[PDB]
Ligand code: HEM
Ligand code: HEM
Ligand SMILES: O=C(O)[C@H](Cc1c[nH]c2ccccc12)NC(=O)C(F)(F)C(F)(F)C(F)(F)C(F)(F)C(F)(F)F
């Protein structure tokens with residue numbers, strides 16, 4: 009039985025297929041042509057891309073497969089270290105940090121973060137209230153200002169003040185450039201070529217910038233002793249119940265860098281896609297706006313009011329179905345095993361879960377998988393197990409899921425309460441790929457409903 | 462009596478003395494050397510610089526002298542046109558605009574603008590509340606954000622959104638570059654030298670940017686009929702009592718451009734100098750802060766509360782004494798006349814009033830004229846006529862005087878209510894000159910008192 013494989017480039021095998029600005033979208037097209045599984049080879053490396061719920065449900069069995077660091081994550085590890093996102097499950101610091109931080113990311117914890125989320129959300133709305141008549145909004149740029157500032161503030165009581173700037177904060181410049189470099193390393197044949205020497209030097213300079221700001225943030229909080237109820241305070245004080253150990257300061261840095269990466273890259277994309285779908289589907293926008301108007305009856309939304317925004321939740325989940333913003337995750341076989349009754353795997357063999365394809369599995373979702381329909385999530389127990397995984401799988405799933413959904417629900421709810429929206433350019437979806445997916449160049453006009461804050 | 466005169470450069474006469482980054486400060490030093498009057502010659506022209514109250518009181522006699530357009534103002538007229546600032550007193554549009562606008566710039570008119578002034582002032586306070594512990598404030602840069610935005614909003618219901626940017630608005634970039642070219646054209650031999658073709662092209666392009674935006678603003682408003690009740694509304698509807706004529710749309714544009722020049726340049730300089738002198742004089746800062754705390758008992762300052770900030774007003778007047786931010790104005794003799802019983806002048810002969818030197822006249826102020834003492838203004842009536850002229854003279858005095866002082870008082874009151882200030886760099890005063898004066902590089906730290914808004 010021969011597993012499908014895309015086109016090759018002689019000795020380089022499939023590698024040059026990733027020499028593109030849009031590798032995930034390319035892989036989606038290959039998946040459409042080849043089906044639920046294909047092998048992908050490079051010099052000295054092989055993986056298998058999975059696209060169907062029936063295979064992915066097996067891949068998600070944690071007794072058989074564990075999280076793998078893709079080559080992308082191995083490069084991100086050069087600045088995110090053994091933080092939660094780029095550590096192996098068997099490294100002592102994973103379970104330790106996981107145990108310490110899980111309570112700080114719970115739904116109940118969101119009650120405590122809510123006030124600071126509102127602070128940044130109000131800044132966004134005020135920005136849009138203050139635009140002149142025929143000016144427009146640069147959507148992913150503003151969502152990124154919001155999401156980065158929220159995690160900065162909620163997490164570590166640090167204000168990036170992104171709405172006060174055109175040029176990002178120096179940490180963000182370095183982080184964005186470090187991420188770009190990490191993703192660019194995947195797609196260059198002969199990575200030791202002299203041309204890439206300057207890229208490597210700038211990389212080391214960006215890592216240093218990140219470490220020095222965050223180390224300083226940690227040291228400052230240690231030296232002040234201030235008990236600001238946030239992630240940083242929790243990490244400086246908390247002990248892992250299992251080992252009885254706290255995180256050391258180096259690992260705390262790695263977690264902070266990791267949360268900032270997450271806040272910048274991934275939540276902003278969700279909000280950007282959600283707004284994109286709303287302006288392309290005005291009946292959905294109407295339903296979401298009506299809910300926002302009916303529910304958010306006070307100038308400052310409450311935690312309880314955000315929980316009440318069911319339809320806005322459904323909008324966000326349908327946006328995640330179509331464009332899960334961190335679109336692939338990797339697994340390895342813990343032991344020899346056979347996938348799907350058909351594909352034998354050896355210990356250590358790697359799998360890639362193509363989340364956007366899983367979410368277009370017609371045998372699960374129906375034939376209309378490209379349509380934006382939030383009512384797919386109106387009665388969510390209808391969704392089969394492992395059919396919807398925008399936040400990954402099992403113990404290695406996104407720790408920030410509740411944070412991200414709370415922020416996104418609050419913000420999207422406020423946006424729909426306060427403004428009508430116009431797709432003035434009839435924007436053509438163009439998806440930029442970094443660590444994540446975003447709708448590049450998405451612009452709208454927002455006409456104020458003149459409801460005070 | 463042969464008039465004193467500074468050093469000459471052969472056939473260039475005194476012209477090269479103004480070929481300096483700091484021409485007003487140069488002229489002040491010359492005044493120190495030469496006294497109350499000196500002649501200043503260049504090829505094809507002459508003026509006389511006055512520095513004493515004794516002589517300036519004659520110059521300010523409107524039966525004997527009228528406002529002259531200095532060469533600097535003649536160049537500003539290429540983009541400010543026949544707006545109030547760059548028009549001759551005998552021009553029909555001067556008298557029309559004067560009669561139409563003056564009542565809208567009264568102390569009592571400020572009740573109408575107060576709310577919009579608070580809007581921008583709160584944005585400033587919030588920016589500074591949001592700075593992190595280690596960070597500092599770029600004072601003139603932030604003061605200019607405030608003052609430009611205030612005149613934009615109050616004047617024409619237009620939001621430059623300066624607190625949302627590092628890059629100034631396109632209009633501002635052009636205006637600033639226009640004003641720079643005007644300044645540069647002064648110290649320049651042959652204007653039609655092909656060398657300056659690019660300068661002229663840039664100049665024309667900046668005029669276009671300025672006219673296009675402002676004309677659109679005006680046209681947009683005329684269309685809607687929206688009675689926004691600002692300077693633009695008054696200008697579109699208002700009739701000159703004398704002629705019975707309104708301003709035409711072209712002249713309205715020049716007034717708006719003129720207001721924007723004014724609210725950008727001179728007013729922010731005042732606030733920057735005031736804060737400078739406050740941090741250099743801690744006892745004065747403390748007295749002003751006591752008043753602010755005693756008077757501004759509400760989170761939103763009221764119009765009447767700003768009028769009660771007597772000491773803050775004294776502080777601003779003392780800043781204006783030392784560093785009047787539009788530091789000189791020009792006059793011409795309406796008829797042959799003798800100045801000071803010594804200097805015969807012919808009809809058309811020109812004078813320059815060197816305001817910073819007038820304000821250092823030891824016969825009026827006492828020997829300690831370099832000292833910052835707001836108490837000099839305990840009773841502003843006590844100052845002799847024509848001794849204190851930071852807003853110029855007579856019917857050609859600053860129309861924006863009450864606007865500027867109300868805005869500056871409000872803002873400085875709020876700053877002193879909400880923050881303690883630290884001169885963390887022990888800043889060395891360095892005054893940059895364009896057509897106005899500012900303390901370049903003035904930076905402070907502001908520690909919040911944590912009083913909510
Ligand atoms: C819409 C927003 C987000 C999406 C779609 C998303 C998606 C994901 C996915 C798919 C994974 C699994 C990665 C893998 O298997 O390799 C993951 C892991 C993670 N995410 Fe997110 N994420 C989001 C927001 C956030 C936020 C806001 C934070 C933190 C502030 C965060 C922190 C993390 C961390 C720490 C992990 C690693 C968890 C572990 O292995 O222990 N994420 N995320
Ligand atoms: C600290 C702030 C300010 C200072 C020191 C200042 C100073 C002056 C001075 C000295 C003049 C006389 C010019 C001459 O004789 O050639 C003047 C004129 C003028 N100023 Fe200001 N000014 C300030 C703020 C403003 C503001 C905020 C506005 C408008 C919003 C404004 C509008 C004008 C206008 C229109 C004139 C021309 C008046 C006329 O001749 O009819 N000024 N200003
Ligand atoms: O980084 C990796 O390991 C894998 C695949 C890969 C990269 N190099 C390989 C060599 C042989 C076989 C497979 C690979 N990379 C990808 O699938 C990808 F295309 F880069 C990717 F999809 F864009 C991605 F990196 F996974 C991603 F989607 F951007 C990421 F967000 F990181 F998951």
Ligand SMILES: O=C(O)[C@H](Cc1c[nH]c2ccccc12)NC(=O)C(F)(F)C(F)(F)C(F)(F)C(F)(F)C(F)(F)F
Pocket residue numbers: 476479484485488501502503506507508530531532533534647787788789790813895896897
């Ligand atoms: O613009 C002018 O006409 C006059 C005088 C002048 C400029 N060029 C001259 C040649 C010969 C004799 C006099 C002059 N300029 C000045 O006095 C000046 F102070 F140098 C000035 F800086 F240019 C100034 F323009 F006056 C000023 F001070 F910057 C201004 F803000 F405009 F008042």
